[PDB]
Amino acid sequence: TTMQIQLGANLKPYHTFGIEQLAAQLVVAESIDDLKALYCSAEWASLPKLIIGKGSNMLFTCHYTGMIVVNRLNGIEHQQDDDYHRLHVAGGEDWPSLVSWCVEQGIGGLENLALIPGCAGSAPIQNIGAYGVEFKDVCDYVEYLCLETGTVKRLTMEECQFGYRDSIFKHQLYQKAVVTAVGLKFAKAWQPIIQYGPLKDLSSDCAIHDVYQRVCATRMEKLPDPAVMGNAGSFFKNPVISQQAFARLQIEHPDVVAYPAEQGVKVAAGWLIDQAGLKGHQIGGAKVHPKQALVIVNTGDASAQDVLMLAADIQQRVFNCYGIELEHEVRFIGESEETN
């Protein structure tokens, strides 16, 4: 009963905003061969296709008239050096589950990425990061179905061109590549990364588990669970501006919060939105969550239009207070593929 095409499928079960909407067609892929039949064959060559993991970084903005392809390729294989653990993770694997698995195996280095919703295959697309770690830091390689050849190719971590919330799959490989698996590499001499938020209370000889527990604890405290109130996480990226640009900003706003970046300064958008006095602001069913002001939440009856107008309102207010232009991180889906 696999590779059954669902016609007129409701999308709420398929993305974390949980907004009422449907897809002309939807199918669950479960193997490399399914993706190969779906993307590199005459059958279903008719429909535009959107590959999704958990839809935890997505907003459907109208009736989706293509075929949604739900990535559920499973498998975790493990091996180890004298020096490293290496995992080969199928792209459909659930990410919060994978980090819990590493932690329970005693595999150190993934724990700052605890509870980020999504599939392992989506992790490289926006180079997920939290608590001072990013996917590029643990990445050995990425494998993908090459839409031009119908064969699986491999990129080293270098060839992925990772940046803040960025990679080659949002550029050259955009719509040309379906990630089928991720190679993760972790030093056996584990080093806690412990400089962010409540991890600062930890000490540098703590255990993997200590770090993981703290991350889970804080996240479950600050971020709404989307099965309770729909959301897509931090709606905007932290804007990255020059040093000089930052110093200028900081003359009028000496209080402004910054995060490290190699090129220029990354400014905390949470802080910008909060000082702009936007916490709790609602349009229709969409609201700025007061405990983490980057997260637009669905209070129950949001439309995509609500979310989009609230985003526009925040962006407007932020640009006025600070002359800074926030860039949305959530992908906006139209009839077929992304818009604006």
Ligand X SMILES: Cc1cc2nc3c(=O)[nH]c(=O)nc-3n(C[C@H](O)[C@H](O)[C@H](O)COP(=O)(O)OP(=O)(O)OC[C@H]3O[C@@H](n4cnc5c(N)ncnc54)[C@H](O)[C@@H]3O)c2cc1C
Q: Is 184 in the site for ligand X (CB under 6 A)?
A: no
Q: Kindly name the residue from 30, 329, 337, 338 that is annotated as catalytic.
A: 329
Are 60 and 233 a contacting pair, CB within 8 Å? no
Q: Is 192 in the site for ligand X (CB under 6 A)?
A: no
Q: Which one of 74-82, 190-198, 228-236, 269-277 is the stretch in contact with ligand X (CB under 6 A)?
A: 228-236
Which lies closer to ligand X via its Cβ, residue 98 or residue 208?
Answer: 98
Which lies closer to ligand X via its Cβ, residue 179 or residue 199?
Answer: 179
Residues 170 and 209: their CA atoms lie apart, in Å, by 34
329 is catalytic: yes
Q: Is 91 in the site for ligand X (CB under 6 A)?
A: yes
Q: Is 231 in the site for ligand X (CB under 6 A)?
A: yes
Q: Is 72 in the site for ligand X (CB under 6 A)?
A: no
Q: Is 9 in the site for ligand X (CB under 6 A)?
A: no
Which lies closer to ligand X via its Cβ, residue 89 or residue 314?
Answer: 89
Q: Give DSSP secondary structure letters for 106-161.
A: T-TT-GGGTT--SBGGGTTTTT-EETTEEGGGTEEEEEEEETTTTEEEEEETGGGT
309 in helix, strand or coil? helix
User: What is the smallest separation between the CB atom of 124 and ligand X, expressed in angstroms?
Assistant: 8
Residues 145 and 97: their CA atoms lie apart, in Å, by 24
Residue in 9, 16, 296, 304 binding ligand X, rule: CB under 6 A: 16
Q: Kindly name the residue from 93, 134, 234, 331 that is annotated as catalytic.
A: 234
Q: What is the CA radius of gyration of the chain?
A: 20
Distance between first and last Cα of the chain: 37
165 is catalytic: yes
Question: Which of positions 249-268 make contact with ligand X (CB under 6 A)?
Answer: none
225 in helix, strand or coil? coil
Q: Is 18 in the site for ligand X (CB under 6 A)?
A: no
Q: Is 24 in the site for ligand X (CB under 6 A)?
A: no
Residue among 152, 169, 173, 153 at smallest CA distance from 35:
152
Q: Is 125 in the site for ligand X (CB under 6 A)?
A: yes
Q: Is 214 in the site for ligand X (CB under 6 A)?
A: no
User: What is the smallest separation between the CB atom of 83 and ligand X, expressed in angstroms?
Assistant: 28
Q: Which one of 56-64, 154-162, 236-244, 270-278 is the stretch in contact with ligand X (CB under 6 A)?
A: 56-64
252 is catalytic: no
For 92, residues 6+ apart whose C-beta sits below 8 A from its C-beta are 29, 30, 53, 71, 72, 73, 74, 119, 120, 121
Q: Which amino acid is at 298?
A: N
Q: Give the residue closest to ligand X by C-beta.
A: 53
How many chain residues are in contact with ligand X, going by CB under 6 A?
34
- Which run of H or of E encompasses 97? helix 95-104
Residue in 9, 139, 215, 223 binding ligand X, rule: CB under 6 A: 223
Residue in 18, 108, 109, 121 binding ligand X, rule: CB under 6 A: 121
Residues 52 and 312: their CA atoms lie apart, in Å, by 25
Q: Which amino acid is at 120?
A: A
Percent helix / strand / coil, the chain, rounded to 5: 25, 30, 45
Q: Is 298 in the site for ligand X (CB under 6 A)?
A: no
Catalytic residue ranges: 165, 234, 329
Q: In the complex, which residues of this chain contact ligand X (CB under 6 A)? A: 16, 50-58, 71, 91, 116-119, 121-123, 125-126, 128-130, 169, 177-179, 223, 226, 231-233, 331
